[PDB]
Subunit: 259 residues, 3 copies
């Protein structure tokens, strides 16, 4: 999709691409290591067995959808390795996963909500997947649109995120009472991350360089690196622990849910 490139003399001074690229690349490398290691741990723990007792699977293999968390974390870590490669090369690299904002997210966070929908047995998994997909593509369109119509694209995304986030919460609540108090605690701390960090992205858009102009692109990159460390890595860890508690309750102890 690329047309632009870093000028031979470098990015013009004062432009949004005139960033601290060694620092951004170091942050991206650290994020890559952390998120990829978290995904590797999730896959290894999933292969260990069901619950904290590590009860062997009857088929000898874990459910395929249960690998979604670790797969998403490993894909995010690989894209952050690519981001570190792009930043350490000075930015504007032909294969830049940093250039088009939220283009990487159209790969992780839809699958992520799918994983969430598979972990909580949430209804309308395809509906939630496509809502997140369209919201992220509206964000990509807003960040590639140089006119005021980007605020239209943003609004379009806000027309896809506000219902979804309102629906998901409701559905999440319907599942929350089902689970035992310990799984409820893990789910509570995962939903705190979800419903307190997903709304941050729309707010960050308004104060970014494409909005009120209060947040620079470098600060945007650092903020979104921390958000991906939270929304992918920490949220996936919390989902893995919630799954372990649910399996210990229902598969190891055989106890029924509060449904």
């Amino acid at each position: 999709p690329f047309y632009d490139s870093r000028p031979p003399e470098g990015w013009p001074k004062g432009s949004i691409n005139d960033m601290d690229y060694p620092l951004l690349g170091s942050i991206c490398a650290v994020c890559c290591v952390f998120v990829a290691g978290s995904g590797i741990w999730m896959l290894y723990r999933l292969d260990l067995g069901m619950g904290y007792s590590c009860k062997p699977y009857k088929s000898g293999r874990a459910p395929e959808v249960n690998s979604l968390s670790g797969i998403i974390c490993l894909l995010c870590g690989t894209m952050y390795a690519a981001k570190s490669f792009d930043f350490f090369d000075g930015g504007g690299t032909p294969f830049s996963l940093n250039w088009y904002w939220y283009l990487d997210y159209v790969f992780t966070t839809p699958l992520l909500i799918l994983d969430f929908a598979f972990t909580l047995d949430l209804p309308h998994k395809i509906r939630y997947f496509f809502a997140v997909f369209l919201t992220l593509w509206c964000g990509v369109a807003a960040f590639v649109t140089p006119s005021a119509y980007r605020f239209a694209y943003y609004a379009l995304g806000c027309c896809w995120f506000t219902p979804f986030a309102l629906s998901l919460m409701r559905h999440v609540k319907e599942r929350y009472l089902v689970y035992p108090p310990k799984c409820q605690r893990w789910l509570f701390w995962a939903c705190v991350i979800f419903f307190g960090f997903w709304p941050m992205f729309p707010i960050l858009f308004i104060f970014s360089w494409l909005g009120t102009g209060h947040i620079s692109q470098q600060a945007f990159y650092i903020i979104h690196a921390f958000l991906d460390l939270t929304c992918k890595s920490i949220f996936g860890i919390l989902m893995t622990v919630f799954r372990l508690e649910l399996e210990e309750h229902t598969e190891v102890q055989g106890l029924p849910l509060n449904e």
Copy 2:
């Protein structure tokens, strides 16, 4: 994928991009509203229950593949909102869903046939990929400036002609299964399918990339109407056919003619 952009002085006069952009944007906005509302109604009606009696689902939720029609209509409505944004900005916008013809279709109409294959229990749900490939052969045909675009078009005609011939046959095998009311709804859906899908290849020949009889603006209006028919009306007809099928088999418990 974009390399081109609207020139600072505007699109050159007499070029294919020198179109009535306020009119195209208004048409795209109306299409967005209509198709998105149709998808919202499809999802709401699906959540209402099975059949016309709105029989509650045993699990409390509808089948996931049954949301395909409304999801496709909502995705098409969102892409038409993006198209209206592009047209109202004068065209040639970096995120232009109007520039690359049939690029948007690679997202809807494959899923659409999937929905169709899921609604009629059609074999080789193959079909999807065939449509996929066909549409990509269209995309290339509209980005190739040489005569080899007619090769790409022909390649698509080598993927659409068998598929459309196979689908019909398979559709016929399912048509006798369904009751006469579901048969009526299926008949009116298949009329749209087999009478409007062939239009796109014919429209290619007489477009600016063929005989030069249809301008790009007329192409946009024609395809807006076609998307209003192939996505919106066809999805409505499929929803009504599903409602009749559920009323026959799930509410009344009657068996199919299989």
Copy 3:
């Protein structure tokens, strides 16, 4: 994604794009015909029935995942028809499936391993799919990166292919003892192709024009056309014959596996 195009006077002499385009287009057309015909035969044979006896399916239709081999071969044949169109037009065509190396592969070979995972009942089908996906995208990034960081991208791909290829082999071995000796023979000849031709691509990268500079882009195109004739077409034929023998053993004769 295209920015470049063939210059009005043609590709500069001595450049990597200054290739024998009629020859490349003829090779691509022959490959298209062969691979598309192999996919058509695979789908027709699948529709014939189970096993060598062509036992009719109970539902009257074959399993959907069993069409993966023929679908992949037909998609590869269509992409090779597009490649022949691009080459016969002189290269650098806006819809060039030859320009971005391994970009076409991100469409076939993941599905291919999925097909493999479905044919051998291999665990972690999604994990293998995403590993191949990420390896191929790392290859695409390496072949679009003009700096030394391409060797980083390559290494990233080598960090995704080496574990996967090591895991797959192990899992394949666990399945190999299950199957009867005839299915074992067909599986052996398919795994020979897999584990002896998939490692070739990383080695070909090193000696290509983006590495040591020993293999030209034209030679790369011919080599990869032959590899796609082997990895898609011949491997799909071997998988179809293995499936036919397995169905003759288990569905026609009703005999159990060595599990």
